[PDB]
């Protein structure tokens with residue numbers, strides 16, 4: 001997928017995570033978000049469409065996804081040990097990373 | 107140090123990080139926060155003073171610091187590669203972890 | 213790319229990292245490995261070609277790359293702060309993760 | 319505790335993890351190792367007893383424990399989701415970090 005449709009996947013599964021009932025559902029959504037994030041890693045955002053692959057802006061852009069994946073990874077562990085409530089909270093806490101990247105490059 | 111004084115160290119160095127000018131200063135403050143966090147790992151918070159070392163609440167309490175240290179660790183790398191602005195932002199993004207723990211156990 | 217060619221990229225850049233001279237070269241190789249790893253995340257290995265997307269084997273398979281990317285992510289920070297020698301060592305220490313996965317699913 | 323007796327705790331619990339039978343036992347040992355590692359964070363190793371708190375050697379020394387804790391943290395999650403065998407393997411995979419630090423500063 002491309003950046004935008006990777007972003008919609010993150011956003012739609014985050015939504016699924018909010019209104020989830022059991023652990024299994026959070027894990028699946030988390031997994032999908034992890035894949036989306038992985039796929040976004042290699043994209044160039046319009047705001048830096050001019051700028052080169054090797055610019056400090058693109059390194060920092062790629063870094064944001066590094067953070068995001070690590071966060072999803074951990075949240076998924078919480079899902080896998082049955083701890084639904086804290087998984088959902090960890091998912092909520094992702095927004096701090098989403099917004100940080102948007103603010104700079106969106 | 108004790109829990110409370112560990113907490114004040116985190117809070118005071120976070121404040122130092124906000125109003126910092128160069129990379130070196132952020133790194134030092136970050137380092138101090140990392141130490142404070144490490145020290146807090148083993149404390150029992152008043153709200154769980156009743157509860158045992160092995161309760162799922164104390165595991166989740168200890169887990170919060172595991173998150174926090176990892177976050178500081180990464181933010182410090184940013185400080186060490188001269189990237190002041192993004193280090194400061196990563197420091198701000200810690201607040202999501204602070205508040206998450208306060209909410210449950212403070 | 214496909215799994216095999218993703219694997220050769222990891223292996224060839226690891227080799228580049230061994231015999232590197234400056235920081236910039238390690239960072240580039242590390243970046244490439246990170247991308248390769250991200251790409252591998254979604255593959256099904258022949259040994260589990262029978263088994264479903266949702267099997268505990270495929271979860272543990274995906275988990276191995278989650279580890280690997282996090283490790284590359286940190287090693288790259290070391291590359292970015294000029295610390296060549298320790299970056300190279302962190303790269304060598306990846307082999308423990310490579311071999312762990314091979315052992316089970318290769 | 320001091321460095322040496324922190325090191326014996328890591329080593330004795332690693333031993334406990336090898337010869338463990340159930341998940342609960344691995345988790346406890348892992349927890350103890352996490353605490354030991356946290357406690358070691360602030361020590362000065364004899365080989366750098368001369369050198370200052372702020373030397374690049376002491377930063378790299380402290381970094382090694384950052385890596386180690388993150389690794390234990392993840393291994394403990396595996397313990398907490400009942401996956402004994404892979405927890406034990408993750409514990410084994412710690413040795414790559416132990417040895418890396420010994421080699422440079424022991």
Ligand code: HEM
Pocket residue numbers: 003004007008010011014045046061062063064065068094095097098099101102105106
């Ligand atoms: C769970 C985390 C996140 C969610 C839910 C999320 C959600 C979204 C949504 C809904 C959009 C609008 C897409 C459009 O322009 O049509 C978007 C755009 C974007 N996001 Fe995210 N996002 C997340 C994380 C991130 C991160 C970590 C980065 C960068 C490191 C990032 C960079 C962007 C960029 C650059 C755009 C603009 C895409 C474009 O217009 O071409 N986002 N995001």
Ligand code: HEM
Pocket residue numbers: 109110113114116117120151152167168169170171174200201203204205207208211212
């Ligand atoms: C940058 C991160 C954090 C900051 C700035 C912070 C700050 C503080 C502050 C200012 C207090 C109140 C001090 C007082 O007047 O007594 C406090 C209390 C507390 N914090 Fe944090 N905190 C952070 C992270 C955490 C985390 C991760 C946890 C748990 C995992 C935690 C658990 C607590 C608890 C339990 C108290 C209550 C202590 C008491 O009542 O004596 N905090 N924190």
Ligand code: HEM
Pocket residue numbers: 215216219220222223226257258273274275276277280306307309310311313314317318
């Ligand atoms: C630096 C890290 C790694 C390196 C250098 C590496 C290297 C390789 C190499 C050289 C091959 C054989 C290529 C061929 O002749 O077909 C291979 C195959 C494989 N690797 Fe890795 N690998 C790494 C990490 C991983 C990880 C983390 C996993 C799983 C989570 C994994 C799973 C596999 C599998 C399943 C195969 C078999 C592919 C096939 O038979 O087509 N590897 N790897």
Ligand code: HEM
Pocket residue numbers: 321322325326328329332363364379380381382383386412413415416417419420423424
């Ligand atoms: C699970 C991981 C590890 C185990 C099992 C382990 C085990 C040990 C043991 C058994 C000793 C001998 C203590 C003595 O001198 O009497 C030791 C020493 C030492 N270890 Fe570790 N170690 C680990 C990780 C680390 C790490 C990550 C570092 C540094 C980043 C480190 C630094 C040292 C140092 C500096 C000494 C020498 C202490 C001294 O002589 O004053 N070790 N370790």
Ligand SMILES: [Zn+2]
Pocket residue numbers: 001002039
């Ligand atoms: Zn795509």
Ligand SMILES: [Zn+2]
Pocket residue numbers: 008012
């Ligand atoms: Zn949608």
Ligand SMILES: [Zn+2]
Pocket residue numbers: 027028031266271
């Ligand atoms: Zn799943």
Ligand SMILES: [Zn+2]
Pocket residue numbers: 074077169172173391395
């Ligand atoms: Zn965790």
Ligand SMILES: [Zn+2]
Pocket residue numbers: 107108145
């Ligand atoms: Zn204390």
Ligand SMILES: [Zn+2]
Pocket residue numbers: 133134137372377
């Ligand atoms: Zn420093």
Ligand SMILES: [Zn+2]
Pocket residue numbers: 063066067180183285289
């Ligand atoms: Zn980072």
Ligand SMILES: [Zn+2]
Pocket residue numbers: 213214251
């Ligand atoms: Zn591909």
Ligand SMILES: [Zn+2]
Pocket residue numbers: 054059239240243
């Ligand atoms: Zn680069």
Ligand SMILES: [Zn+2]
Pocket residue numbers: 179183286289381384385
């Ligand atoms: Zn690091």
Ligand SMILES: [Zn+2]
Pocket residue numbers: 319320357
């Ligand atoms: Zn001590």
Ligand SMILES: [Zn+2]
Pocket residue numbers: 326330
């Ligand atoms: Zn002993």
